[PDB]
Amino acid sequence: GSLTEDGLSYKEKFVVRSYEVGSNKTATVETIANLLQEVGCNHAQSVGFSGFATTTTMRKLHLIWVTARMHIEIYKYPAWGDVVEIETWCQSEGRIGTRRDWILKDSVTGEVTGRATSKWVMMNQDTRRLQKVSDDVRDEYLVFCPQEPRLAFPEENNRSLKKIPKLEDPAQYSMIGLKPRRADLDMNQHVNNVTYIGWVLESIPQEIVDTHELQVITLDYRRECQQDDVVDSLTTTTSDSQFLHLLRLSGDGQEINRGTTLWRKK
Amino acid sequence: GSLTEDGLSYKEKFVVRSYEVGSNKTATVETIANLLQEVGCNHAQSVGFSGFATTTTMRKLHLIWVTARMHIEIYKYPAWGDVVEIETWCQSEGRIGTRRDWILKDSVTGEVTGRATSKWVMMNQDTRRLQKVSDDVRDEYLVFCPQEPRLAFPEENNRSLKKIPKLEDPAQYSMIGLKPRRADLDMNQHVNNVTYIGWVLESIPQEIVDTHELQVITLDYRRECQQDDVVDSLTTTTSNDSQFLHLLRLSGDGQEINRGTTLWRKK
Ligand SMILES: CS(=O)(=O)Cc1nc2ccccc2[nH]1
Ligand SMILES: CS(=O)(=O)Cc1nc2ccccc2[nH]1
C-alpha cells in the first residue's frame, strides 16, 4: 500500500482469499468491510496516526474517533484469487466530525466495482460523551485531507444520507441470542464493527441470500455490544428486495444498530 | 505464492492485518490457522487440484479429503505489519490417508517461528463413510509429494501423535450455547475448521488468556457441526506451564464433535 502522488489519499491491493468468499466464490460483504477497515488503518499509519487514528493531543484528552454510520454499495463482488484495489481518503464535515470514503476497483480492467462512505464522531473513551471536534484538533488533520470536496457519493440526497427509521414489533424475521466470541474482538478487546454487519445479515432468510446478491447496506452505530452482552437481530421486508434491520440487546431491548439493505435478483 | 524449485512444496508470504491481531497486537492462532488453510488451498491450485483438493476421479466417486487432526506449535506470533512466510507440503501415510505439514518463518530474520501438522482421511461426501485410499487415487497424488520422509515434527514421541482422552463431567470451565454465523461458513456452506479452534478456546478463562501465550494446540475432528446445531465448549486444567483438556459437544444430546489439548506458557 501507498499514499498517492499528492499524499491526500491511500491505495492498496488485496488478493481475495479462499476463506474470504461465500457460496458464489466471491468475497463476502464482511470481507469487503474488513478490507476497508485495513486500508483505513494503513492510511493512518502512513501519516503518523495511531484503530482510533488519534493525535498525541487526542490521546492526552482521552478522545477517540468512533463510527456513527457505514454505507457500502457493491456492483460486483471480487472473485476468489482476484486482486481488488482500494483507494481511501478523509474529509472534515465541520464540527460534526470526519467522513472517510472508499472506491473499490478491479485491478485488471480498472472499473469501479464498489464504493463506500462512513461518518465518524469524536468521543471521550471513558465517559463515552461526544465533545465535538475542536479547532486545535481539526487543524492537525486538515493537512492530510483534500480542500476541494471529493465525494464517493456525490448525487444530491443519495442513499448514504437517508434517515433510517426504528423497526416496529413484530419483526418478520429474527435471529435471537447472538453473542460475540474472541475472534470478533479487536486489539483493544471491543467488538469489531464488521461483526455488527454480520449480525444484521443473520436475520435475512437463506432463500433471499441464495437467490439475491446484496447491492447496498447502510448501518447506524448507536451503542456498543459489550462482549458479555447478547444480541437480537430483527428484519422486515419493506418492498429488488429491501429490508429494515434492528439490532437490540436480548434482555431490555436497548438498540445498538439500525440499518437497511437492498438486494438484486440473481 | 509459488511452488519451490523442486515442485514438491509451496511457499507464500502474508502481511499481518490490523483485524487479524489480538490484545498483544500479534496474530491470533485462528489467523495462523486461516493462513495455513490459505497456503494449503493455493498449493492445491498450483498443481491442478480442486477446499477438498480432489482429482477428477475422486469427484466422480464423490470422495473428499477431510481433516482428522490438526496440531499447531507457535514459538512467536507474528506482529501486526510483519511478513510471515509459510512453506507447506503433503505426504502419504499409507492407506490411512495423507499428512499436510507447514513451517512458519519470520521473513526478515529467517527464523522458524512456528510449525504445524495435519492428518487427513478420504470420505464419501454423501454417506460420510470412510474408505482407505485406493492405489489409483494414491498414485495421482504421489508425483506432488517428496519420496523421502519430510516431517515438521520428527521427534521420537512428539506431541502431534499423542492420543487425546475424553473429558469427564463436571468440567472446570464451560462456554455454552455457541452457534456458527454465515461468516463461519466456507464456500460449500459447511462450518470452517478454524471455527472449532475458536470454540475450543472460548472456554479458557480470560485470566489465562491475559497472563499466558498459547504454545501448543492439538485438535481431533470427529463430527461436523451443522449450520443449525448448538455447541458446548468444556475445559479442565490438567497441570511454569498450564495444560488443558478440551471437549466440544452438541448442546442437546452431548454428541462429541471435537476433543483437544492446549499448552500455555507464562508471559
Ligand atoms: C475519523 S478517522 O477517519 O479515523 C480520522 C482520520 N483522518 C485521517 C486523515 C488521514 C489519515 C488518517 C486519518 N484518520
Ligand atoms: C488431504 S490434502 O493434503 O488436502 C490432499 C492434497 N495432497 C496434495 C499434494 C499436493 C498438492 C495439493 C494436495 N492436496
Interface check for B109 against chain A (CB to CB < 8 A): the answer is no
Cα dihedral B140, B146, B147, B153 in deg (nearest 10): -120
Strand-pair category, B83-92 with B212-221: unpaired
The catalytic residue positions of B are: 188, 190, 225
Interface check for B206 against chain A (CB to CB < 8 A): the answer is no
Nearest CA to ligand 2 atom 5: B53
Is the residue at B246 inside a domain? yes
- What is the best residue among B49, B52, B133 to mutate for testing ligand 2's pocket, by most ligand atoms within 8 Å of CB? B49
Is the residue at B166 inside a domain? no
Annotated catalytic residue A190: yes
CATH code of residue A233? 3.10.129.10
Choose one of A97, A126, A161: the last residue of a domain. Answer: A161
3-class DSSP state of A184: helix
The beta-carbon neighbor of A181 closest among B18, B45, B202 is B202
The helix or strand, by DSSP H or E, that contains position A233, with its residue range, turns out to be strand A231-237
Q: Is there a single domain that holds both residue B11 and residue B112?
A: yes
Is the residue at A168 inside a domain? no
Interface check for B217 against chain A (CB to CB < 8 A): the answer is no
User: Is the Cβ–Cβ distance between B223 and B257 less than 8 Å?
Assistant: yes
DSSP letter, residue A155:
S
The nearest CA of chain A is from the CA of B189 a distance in Å of: 7
3-class DSSP state of A3: strand
The nearest CA of chain B is from the CA of A17 a distance in Å of: 7
Cα–Cα distances in Å, from A133 out to A89, A139, B129, B222? 18, 10, 63, 55
Determined by X-ray
Cα–Cα distances in Å, from B142 out to A107, B4, B6, B91, B133? 37, 17, 14, 8, 12
CA A141, A146, A147, A151 torsion: positive or negative? negative
State the catalytic residue, choosing from A188, A192, A193, A257: A188
Alpha helices by DSSP H, A76-213: 135-142, 193-201, 206-211
Is the residue at A166 inside a domain? no
Q: Is there a single domain that holds both residue B17 and residue B120?
A: yes
The nearest CA of chain A is from the CA of B29 a distance in Å of: 10
Q: Is there a single domain that holds both residue B99 and residue B220?
A: no
Q: Is there a single domain that holds both residue A7 and residue A94?
A: yes
CB of A145 closer than 6 angstroms to any ligand 1 atom: yes
- What is the best residue among B70, B98, B133 to mutate for testing ligand 2's pocket, by most ligand atoms within 8 Å of CB? B98
User: Is the Cβ–Cβ distance between B220 and B164 less than 8 Å?
Assistant: yes
Cα B242 vs. chain centroid, distance in angstroms?
21
Q: Is there a single domain that holds both residue B55 and residue B96?
A: yes
Strand-pair category, A212-221 with A98-106: unpaired
Number of H helices, E strands in chain A: 5, 11
User: Is the Cβ–Cβ distance between A10 and A58 less than 8 Å?
Assistant: no
Exposed/middle/buried for A153, CB within 10 Å: 0-12, 13-18, 19+? middle
CB–CB contacts below 8 A, A to B: 77
User: Is the Cβ–Cβ distance between A121 and A66 less than 8 Å?
Assistant: yes
Task: Find the farthest-apart pair of alpha carbons in chain B and give their distance in angstroms, rounded.
Answer: 53
Minimal CA–CA distance to B67: which of B262, B260, B204, B263? Answer: B260
Q: Is there a single domain that holds both residue A132 and residue A206?
A: no
Task: Enumerate the β-bridge partners of residue A82.
Answer: none
Q: Is there a single domain that holds both residue A203 and residue A151?
A: no
Is the residue at B168 inside a domain? no
Q: Is there a single domain that holds both residue A135 and residue A198?
A: no
- The reply to whether residue B186 touches residue A19, judged by beta carbons under 8 angstroms, is yes
* Single-letter residue type at B209: V
Minimal CA–CA distance to A91: which of A72, A58, A119, A63? Answer: A119
Q: How many domains does chain A have?
A: 2
CB of A53 closer than 6 angstroms to any ligand 1 atom: yes
Contacts of B113 (CB under 8 A, 6+ apart): B74, B75, B76, B77, B78, B84, B104, B105, B106
Choose one of A161, A182, A209: the last residue of a domain. Answer: A161
Is the residue at B138 inside a domain? yes
Q: Is there a single domain that holds both residue A126 and residue A193?
A: no
Minimal CA–CA distance to A138: which of A122, A151, A160? Answer: A122
Give chain A positions within 8 Å (CB) of B186: 19
User: Is the Cβ–Cβ distance between B95 and B159 less than 8 Å?
Assistant: no
Place of cell 445479515: A201
What is the rounded CA–CA span in Å between residue A90 and residue B216? Answer: 42
From ligand 2's centre to the CA of A8, what distance in Å?
Answer: 46
Choose one of B128, B156, B184: the last residue of a domain. Answer: B156
Alpha helices by DSSP H, chain A: 29-46, 56-60, 135-142, 193-201, 206-211
Exposed/middle/buried for B158, CB within 10 Å: 0-12, 13-18, 19+? middle
Cα nearest neighbour of A51 on chain B: B18
Angstrom resolution of this structure: 2.0
Is the residue at A145 inside a domain? yes
User: Is the Cβ–Cβ distance between B235 and B169 less than 8 Å?
Assistant: no
Q: Which atom of ligand 2 is nearest to the CA of B49?
A: 12
The beta-carbon neighbor of B23 closest among A80, A187, A198 is A187
Is the residue at B132 inside a domain? yes
With b for 16 or more beta-carbon neighbours within 10 A and e for fewer, the A214-230 pattern comes to: bbbbbbbbeeebeeebe
What is the rounded CA–CA span in Å between residue B190 and residue B185? Answer: 5
Pocket residues: Cβ below 6 A from ligand 2: B 43-44, 47, 49, 53, 65, 90, 98, 100, 120, 141, 144-145
What is the rounded CA–CA span in Å between residue B161 and residue B149? Answer: 16
What is the rounded CA–CA span in Å between residue A40 and residue A198? Answer: 20
CB of A49 closer than 6 angstroms to any ligand 1 atom: yes
**Nine-digit cell string for A166:** 426504528
Minimal CA–CA distance to A122: which of A201, A171, A53? Answer: A53
Instruction: Write out the residue range of the structural domain in which residue B51 sits.
Output: 2-156
**Nine-digit cell string for B3:** 511452488
The helix or strand, by DSSP H or E, that contains position A222, with its residue range, turns out to be none
Contacts of B234 (CB under 8 A, 6+ apart): B167, B171, B173, B174, B203, B246, B247, B248, B249
User: Is the Cβ–Cβ distance between B246 and B203 less than 8 Å?
Assistant: yes
As a whole number of Å, the end-to-end CA separation of chain B is 34
Task: Find the farthest-apart pair of alpha carbons in chain A and give their distance in angstroms, rounded.
Answer: 53
From ligand 2's centre to the CA of A36, what distance in Å?
Answer: 33
Q: Is there a single domain that holds both residue B110 and residue B199?
A: no
Q: Is there a single domain that holds both residue B62 and residue B129?
A: yes
Contacts of B243 (CB under 8 A, 6+ apart): B237, B261, B262, B263, B264
Place of cell 482421511: B121
As a whole number of Å, the end-to-end CA separation of chain A is 34
Cα–Cα distances in Å, from B100 out to A150, B6, B8? 50, 17, 12
What DSSP line would sit under chain B, residue for residue?
Answer: -EE-TTSSSEEEEEEPPGGGB-TTSBB-HHHHHHHHHHHHHHHHHHTT-------HHHHHHTEEEEEEEEEEEESSPPBTT-EEEEEEEEEEBTBT-EEEEEEEEETTT--EEEEEEEEEEEEETTT--B-PPPHHHHHHHHTTS-SS---S--STT-GGGPPPPPP-SSPSEEEEEE---GGGB-TTSSBPHHHHHHHHHTTS-HHHHHHEEEEEEEEEE-SPPPTT--EEEEEEE---EEEEEEEEEETTT--EEEEEEEEEEE-
Q: Is there a single domain that holds both residue A42 and residue A145?
A: yes
Contacts of A26 (CB under 8 A, 6+ apart): A16, A77, A78, A79, A80
Cα nearest neighbour of A23 on chain B: B187
